[PDB]
Amino acid sequence: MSRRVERLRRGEGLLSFGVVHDSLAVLGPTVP
Amino acid sequence: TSVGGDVRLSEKDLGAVLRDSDEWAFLEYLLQMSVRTSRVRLLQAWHIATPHLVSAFERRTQGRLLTYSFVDTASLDEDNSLQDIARRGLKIPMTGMRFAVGNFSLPGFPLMRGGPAEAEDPFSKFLDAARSQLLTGERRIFEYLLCQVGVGRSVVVEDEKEACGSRFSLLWEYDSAYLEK
Amino acid sequence: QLSAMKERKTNYLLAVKRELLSEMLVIEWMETFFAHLRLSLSPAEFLSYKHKFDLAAANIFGGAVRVDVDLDSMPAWMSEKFILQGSFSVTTAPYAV
Amino acid sequence: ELVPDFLFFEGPLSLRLMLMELLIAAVAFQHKQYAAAIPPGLKVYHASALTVNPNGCHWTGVAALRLIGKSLMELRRFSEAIMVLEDAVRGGRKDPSLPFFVTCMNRYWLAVALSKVGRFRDARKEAAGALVVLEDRLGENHPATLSALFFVAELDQTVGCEDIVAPPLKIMDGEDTLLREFGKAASVDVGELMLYRPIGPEDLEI
Amino acid sequence: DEWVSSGISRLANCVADLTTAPSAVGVLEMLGEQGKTGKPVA
Amino acid sequence: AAVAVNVSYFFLQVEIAQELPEGTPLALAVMYRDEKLCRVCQQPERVVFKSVYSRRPKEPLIMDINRTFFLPFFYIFPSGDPALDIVIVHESTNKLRKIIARTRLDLGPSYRRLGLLRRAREFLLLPRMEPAGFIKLAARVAHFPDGSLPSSFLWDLDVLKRKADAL
Amino acid sequence: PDAWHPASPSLIWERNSTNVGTRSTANVFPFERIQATQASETRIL
Amino acid sequence: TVALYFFRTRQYGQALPLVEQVLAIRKKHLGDFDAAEPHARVADCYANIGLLHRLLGHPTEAFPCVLIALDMRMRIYQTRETSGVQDLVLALGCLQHQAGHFRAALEAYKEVWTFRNNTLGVTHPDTVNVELLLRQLEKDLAAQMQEDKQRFV
Amino acid sequence: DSALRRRDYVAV
Amino acid sequence: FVHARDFELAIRHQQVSQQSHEGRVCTELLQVVKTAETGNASHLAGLQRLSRGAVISTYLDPLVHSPIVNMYAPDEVLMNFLLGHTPETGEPSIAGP
Amino acid sequence: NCLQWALDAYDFHLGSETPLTVGTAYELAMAIFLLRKATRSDEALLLVETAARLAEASLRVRTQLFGRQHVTTLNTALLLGLLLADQGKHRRAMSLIEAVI
Amino acid sequence: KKVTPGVLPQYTFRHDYVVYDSSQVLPRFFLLFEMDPSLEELFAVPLCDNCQDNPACIWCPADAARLCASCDELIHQQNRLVSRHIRVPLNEMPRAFGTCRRHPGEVYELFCSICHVAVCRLCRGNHLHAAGRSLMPLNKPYQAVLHMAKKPHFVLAARRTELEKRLEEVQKMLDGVRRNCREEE
């Protein structure tokens, strides 16, 4: 609950969920 | 980029995209957002997705994810000429083919000054005129392919030197390979 | 080796989370870009690029959610509980042939 | 009753269920419901490309995109009515098992949607191409042939007489259409600004 | 610190696998060093 | 689709309605011979929450309930045969939700049956708790308005207990 | 003219400490080839 | 004066060769770093050469130029609270913040903030701007922790 | 468990 | 050997019912109404008594479901432990030695 | 801290969707709400941020395990309301206390 | 080169995938496009007037400055008299509407309703939807579009209702898998 249009401007959207995407990478399937 | 032989693209062939149309607006917007600059305007557009390729693509990409990507036709192998793309669907060699999803800078006109430059993935007159031509950077115009890639449940793996198909396995649970640094 | 199969189970579920994150991060890529358009366009061009943003919205993300994420869609080994059995008994060796 | 009967006994890609959605979309269009014909007709198009003839089109697919194309046209959403009918034209062209009448009627309604949205040169090109194939194959006295000839003549009439019926002129500007110094307080609509515009010596350049 | 994990588990390849549930003896040590912080008035 | 029952006006008689005071408002809710008196009034459209009006009976009470109630059509209607009964409840933090009227019952087994269109005209019905005294009006079948107004059953779990135990 | 060359200590720090090839999403402002507003009109505005 | 004109036009690069001559002339027809008594004109111009060489991008050799300015202003103005000293310790803090070095530019920033709070207000542009450098130090500290302690791959 | 299925196919 | 299936059911992950407690007893007991409507006494041991055990009270008074009511009927002991946990008796098992 | 470890042991064993691990989460949110009141420290805004996540996750499970009419799910919505008003988000606290009543 | 004015869109998203099957790629469009340096950069928010190191966000008519979001707090949260400046964002700056770009230089007059592009004097009689009415005055609908662009699009908010919803049930199966392998540990 905040000001949505200023949230898009400063960018706690795309940038905040980019690091969630990076933290969930985990390299290597198993290396069988 | 050599459109197969010495044939010009005909309307009985690959369909035309009308100027100031709704699909002209969609192609312009996804091509301007990727380069993040308004100086890049579209000057020709074609439809190369015959319904045979659409039905086969939808069957394979069932439950996967679909991302839009751009491929340079000049960097394409000359087996994948535009005449051949109209029936086969941009056939992939055993080494695999790379794909850029999102922002990219056009070659020769960089918009990124860092370590890398987010350049497009591949797969004395030379300075006399260049002192008044390449400083202004006169228009050189590109031929790309906006292709929908069915990347679904990718596995993150590091640099492409070991992500090539000559050594990478691609376990059957997966059908794509996300790249790290 | 228990973390080897645990990586087999969880990296598939985390690749599902990675592609669900990828489609919803790229709807943020639409919105945070268009916020910069509003502050950079004269009002004549904003009405045109609102139509182009509406058209790009309805063409890319127009239908349903294409990823299904369902146990039926998952492989057959997302169903069992990794049964363990055995022993590590440390005894002597027999003294007779 | 039969939607869960056919999603379960025939899978998600069913021939009987795809024909159910086409019949419901057809009776919704016949009763002039307009909306609630796009959601069933879109299920016909999303199924018929895969369930029958994935080499391209069908009569069910053509009737699906035409039922969608008519309804989105007449609901004043003219923009995606162009994209729906153009997709019907491009799929149907280089394809057997569909006669000349399918690829000519689809082109004709593409030009009818393109004239209603307003591009007059582009709609005349498709209306002329649909006219030519209809003259050669299916006679010259058939009502579809006469409607295509009337449509080609109508777009030549509209692009040639719009400039004379409503000359460019310099209206909507108070002191350029009476009204403000005449008694009325603005007009806004073009159909009234043209009506009260007095011709003058300066307008003869236009 | 993002990498926080007691020794109770040894299975980790991401940051979400780190369980912070204290061990059985771990509770009795670092709950025990809390009544000796104070010393009933001065 | 749906069903559209409009009340028009209300009439009540010189019994327990007399000691209904001049301060307590009422609430009128239509039902399915099923569900909860609690959950019908929480859902806004099916119930009316008028304040009690005109504040001087002098006679048997007469008082206005306009508006039409749009209730979800059930093409199968679980728990067997459908019925339509309308209740009146004492909406106050005094004497709580009570039974003041039961009104009509029955709709026809898998309606489009005995009771569909013979309640569509303007009729006069009979609340009964317990003796007689008459008012209601009207019913109809909706033209399926548009975007799926709720269309979920409001199951009373106590009556679902005894019917499942009986089966 | 020349490059932007920011004056903030933080915007310089993000230029020579972090790079965009490591993150899927990144702020790009202390990396772009932005004009420096040239001389005379910088004094005006 | 020409070094000042290049400053107001954002052309900091040409300002460095101009100020370097100003150091050279002021050194020999005035004092120096020690020079028995110290002069405020020499100490001011050493502050200028470290400020302008910060702006080009080199933090490492602008550091000794501002240390000499802080020592000279310590001997001219004496005590610790004077506003000239508090401009220079702000320059040490911003030099540190340019070349990483967190948790020590915090205490350098807070020293400027506490003096400017009770002699210029909680609202003055010289205090809110230091507060902006505190907030923007917190964004860089959050990013640095999330790019070096998040590498669990 | 499906690996236990394959073990029993080889064994008794 | 009698409850042979529920031992093997503890080898499965199952599916988590994405509904409330009222939502669980809604779709479970409404299933019981119609499956008892179709008839046949062979259904009875499957779900008309197995899915019957779904109370519609969050509150349980402790004297029933006590720690010492597991003495009058041991069948629910082998269901509250064997992954039944309060939330299909068809195929046989060959009774050979 | 004792409630902090108990939340860590119930979700390790029974998971994070059981009534027992929701009771530990709600009591930890109430405990950390008393910690801010007693100390009255202005640096405890990060303490209230983790107070919001624990009570919000407690509300979601309690709606889907006990219904919207139960003593546990009512005062968890009330504690969550007081915490959002404490953050300064004043009208999310409005709708939450409006939902309690 | 690289003398592009203003601040470009500063947010990048980039993934690089590698696929192995031909049926996984559907070639859809063939695009011939032009990089042109002599065109005007339409996508450019100017730099801040005060600090010249942030992109501007707020235009203040009282100060006549293209301020950024950080220096807005610097010079407007000062002493109490300079705290009442009516600050609109940089979109609402007084600026010319522009010319048609199909016929050069005649100033727009109305807005076409069915197609989202406005009209001019030359093209009014021959517009796309030139003939309740499709032609309506220009000032009103731009204020409605600006207010509509503040709330999220309904079709992208439909991605919020389903892509988020699917994440909790992947976390539920992941919590089941992790709990399973931790008891086996």
DSSP assignment of B87-155: TS-SPPPTT-EEEEEE--BPTTS----SSS--BPP---HHHHTTTTTTTTT---EEEEEEEEE---S-E
What does DSSP say about strands B67-72 and L56-60: parallel, antiparallel, or unpaired?
A: unpaired
Determine the 3-state secondary structure of F90 from DSSP.
strand
DSSP assignment of chain D: -HHHHHHHHS-SS-HHHHHHHHHHHHHHHHTT--TTSHHHHHHHHHHHHHHS-TTS--HHHHHHHHHHHHHHHHTT-HHHHHHHHHHHHHHHSS-SSS-HHHHHHHHHHHHHHHHHHT-HHHHHHHHHHHHHHHHHSS-SSSHHHHHHHHHHHHHHHHHHHHHHHS-----SSSTTSSSTTTT-----SHHHHTTTPPP-GGGG--
Measured between CA atoms, how close is E1 to chain A, in angstroms?
14
Distance CA L67, CA L73 (A): 10
Cβ-based neighbour number of residue L112 at 10 Å: 21
Residue with tokens 């139960």: K70
Contact K2, K46 (CB under 8 A): no
Q: Write the burial class of residue D158 (CB in 10 Å: 0-12 exposed, 13-18 middle, 19+ buried).
A: middle
Identify whether F130 is preceded by a cis peptide bond (ω within 30 of 0).
Answer: yes
Burial per residue of L14-37, b for 16 or more beta-carbon CB atoms within 10 angstroms, e otherwise: bbbbbbbebbbbbbbbbbebebbe
Cβ-based neighbour number of residue J11 at 10 Å: 15
Q: Which residues does chain A have within 8 Å of residue K89's beta carbon, measured at their own beta carbons?
A: 1
Torsion of CA D51, D52, D55, D57, to 10 degrees: -100
DSSP assignment of B39-98: TEEEEEEEE---HHHHHHHHHHSSSS--EEEEEESSSS-TTS-HHHHTTS-SPPPTT-EE
Q: Say yes or no: H128 contacts chain L, CB-CB below 8 A.
A: yes
Instruction: Provide the token pair at L109.
Output: 């007059």
Contact L13, G25 (CB under 8 A): yes
Region of residue J66 (phi > 0: left; psi between -120 and 50: alpha; otherwise: beta): beta
| CA quadruple B13, B18, B21, B23: dihedral sign | positive
Can you state the angle between helices D15-30 and D38-51, rounded to 10 degrees? 150
Measured between CA atoms, how close is I1 to chain C, in angstroms?
6
Contact state of H152 with E2 under an 8 Å Cβ cutoff: yes
Determine the 3-state secondary structure of F124 from DSSP.
coil
Determine the 3-state secondary structure of J41 from DSSP.
helix
Measured between CA atoms, how close is D82 to chain B, in angstroms?
8
Measured between CA atoms, how close is E5 to chain H, in angstroms?
13
| CA quadruple D118, D120, D121, D123: dihedral sign | positive
What does DSSP say about strands F68-72 and F2-6: parallel, antiparallel, or unpaired?
A: antiparallel
Contact state of D188 with L137 under an 8 Å Cβ cutoff: yes
Q: Considering just the CA atoms, what is the radius of gyration of chain J in Å?
A: 15
For D82, half-sphere exposure in the C-beta direction (CA atoms, 13 angstrom radius) is 24
Ordered alpha helix ranges (H), chain H: 2-8, 15-28, 40-56, 63-76, 83-98, 105-120, 125-148
Q: Say yes or no: L173 contacts chain E, CB-CB below 8 A.
A: no
Contact H49, H19 (CB under 8 A): yes
Distance CA D117, CA D113 (A): 6
Residue of E nearest to C4 (CA): E11
Q: Which of A28, H153, C8 is nearest to B157 (CA)?
A: A28
Q: What is the DSSP letter of J43?
A: G
Distance CA D36, CA F146 (A): 9
- Among L114, L122, L125, whose Cβ lies nearest the Cβ of D76? L114
Distance CA C66, CA C60 (A): 11
What Å distances lie between residue B181 and A30, B56, L13, L36, CA to CA?
19, 33, 14, 32
**CA triple J51-J54-J60, angle to 5 deg:** 155
Q: Which residues does chain D have within 8 Å of residue B59's beta carbon, measured at their own beta carbons?
A: 50
- Among F79, F161, F163, whose Cβ lies nearest the Cβ of J56? F161
What does DSSP say about strands L25-35 and B176-179: parallel, antiparallel, or unpaired?
A: unpaired
Q: Which H or E run contains C7?
A: helix C2-38
What Å distances lie between residue L145 and A5, C42, C54, F37, L156, CA to CA?
14, 13, 12, 46, 17
**Residue E41: what residue type?**
V
Distance CA D78, CA D119 (A): 12
Q: Say yes or no: G29 contacts chain L, CB-CB below 8 A.
A: yes
Interface test with I, best of C79, C80, C85 (most I CBs within 10 A): C80
Residue with tokens 């505005």: G45
Torsion of CA K35, K39, K43, K45, to 10 degrees: 30
What Å distances lie between residue D148 and D108, D131, F2, J61, L131, CA to CA?
7, 6, 45, 82, 21
Residue with tokens 């994150």: C21
Distance CA B26, CA B3 (A): 24
Chains touching G by CB (3 or more pairs below 8 Å): A, B, H, L
Q: What is the DSSP letter of G32?
A: S
Distance CA L36, CA L31 (A): 16
Distance CA H1, CA L13 (A): 46
Q: Which residues does chain L have within 8 Å of residue D117's beta carbon, measured at their own beta carbons?
A: 114-115, 128-129
Measured between CA atoms, how close is H103 to chain E, in angstroms?
16
Contact L124, D167 (CB under 8 A): no
Residue of B nearest to A28 (CA): B157
| CA quadruple B19, B20, B26, B30: dihedral sign | positive
Chains touching D by CB (3 or more pairs below 8 Å): B, L
Instruction: Provide the token pair at L28.
Output: 């859809």
Distance CA C61, CA B68 (A): 11
Looking only at Cα atoms, what is the longest distance across chain C?
Answer: 99
What does DSSP say about strands F47-48 and B155-157: parallel, antiparallel, or unpaired?
A: unpaired
Distance CA H70, CA H87 (A): 9
Q: Which residues does chain B have within 8 Å of residue A26's beta carbon, measured at their own beta carbons?
A: 156
What Å distances lie between residue K4 and K9, K15, L149, CA to CA?
9, 15, 44
Contact C62, L130 (CB under 8 A): no
Distance CA E20, CA K5 (A): 8
Contacts of E19 (CB under 8 A, 6+ apart): E5, E6, E8, E9, K8, K12, L182
Measured between CA atoms, how close is L119 to chain B, in angstroms?
14
Contacts of F14 (CB under 8 A, 6+ apart): F59, F60
Chain centroid, CA C69 distance in Å:
9
Chains touching E by CB (3 or more pairs below 8 Å): A, C, H, K, L
Determine the 3-state secondary structure of K40 from DSSP.
coil
Instruction: Provide the token pair at B170.
Output: 């691609």
Q: Which of L10, L72, L66, L71 is nearest to L43 (CA)?
A: L10
Q: Which of K94, K84, K8 is nearest to K51 (CA)?
A: K84
Contact G44, H127 (CB under 8 A): no
Region of residue J46 (phi > 0: left; psi between -120 and 50: alpha; otherwise: beta): alpha
Contacts with K, J 48-77, CB within 8 Å: 58
Distance CA J14, CA J84 (A): 11
Instruction: Provide the token pair at K83.
Output: 């915490």
This structure was determined by cryo-EM
Strand (E) positions, F2-147? Answer: 2-6, 9-11, 26-30, 47-48, 62-64, 68-72, 86-90
Measured between CA atoms, how close is L121 to chain D, in angstroms?
7
J–L contact: 3+ Cβ pairs < 8 A: yes
Q: Say yes or no: A32 contacts chain B, CB-CB below 8 A.
A: yes
Contacts of H52 (CB under 8 A, 6+ apart): H7, H12, H15, H16, H19
Distance CA D185, CA D147 (A): 45
Chains touching H by CB (3 or more pairs below 8 Å): A, E, G, L
Chains touching F by CB (3 or more pairs below 8 Å): J
What Å distances lie between residue K26 and C59, K5, K76, K80, CA to CA?
44, 13, 7, 9
Residue of E nearest to L183 (CA): E9
Distance CA D189, CA J91 (A): 78
Contact H137, H106 (CB under 8 A): yes
Alpha carbon distance, N-terminus to C-terminus of chain E: 34
Contact state of L130 with D118 under an 8 Å Cβ cutoff: yes
Q: Write the burial class of residue B131 (CB in 10 Å: 0-12 exposed, 13-18 middle, 19+ buried).
A: exposed
Q: Which residues does chain G have within 8 Å of residue L65's beta carbon, measured at their own beta carbons?
A: 45
Contact state of J33 with F161 under an 8 Å Cβ cutoff: no
Contact state of L8 with B103 under an 8 Å Cβ cutoff: no
Q: Which residues does chain B have within 8 Å of residue A25's beta carbon, measured at their own beta carbons?
A: 156, 178, 180
Contact D15, D21 (CB under 8 A): no
Ordered alpha helix ranges (H), chain E: 24-30
Name L136's bridge partners: L111
Distance CA D37, CA D24 (A): 8
Q: Which of B25, B36, B151, B143 is nearest to B100 (CA)?
A: B151
Name F6's bridge partners: F68
Contacts of K31 (CB under 8 A, 6+ apart): K3
Name F69's bridge partners: F5
Strand (E) positions, L95-156? Answer: 110-112, 135-137
Distance CA F164, CA J32 (A): 6
Residue with tokens 């008028």: F50
Q: Which residues does chain H have within 8 Å of residue E3's beta carbon, measured at their own beta carbons?
A: 149, 152
Contact E28, E42 (CB under 8 A): no
What does DSSP say about strands B176-179 and B155-157: parallel, antiparallel, or unpaired?
A: parallel
Contacts of G32 (CB under 8 A, 6+ apart): B111, B112, B113, G4, L7, L8, L10
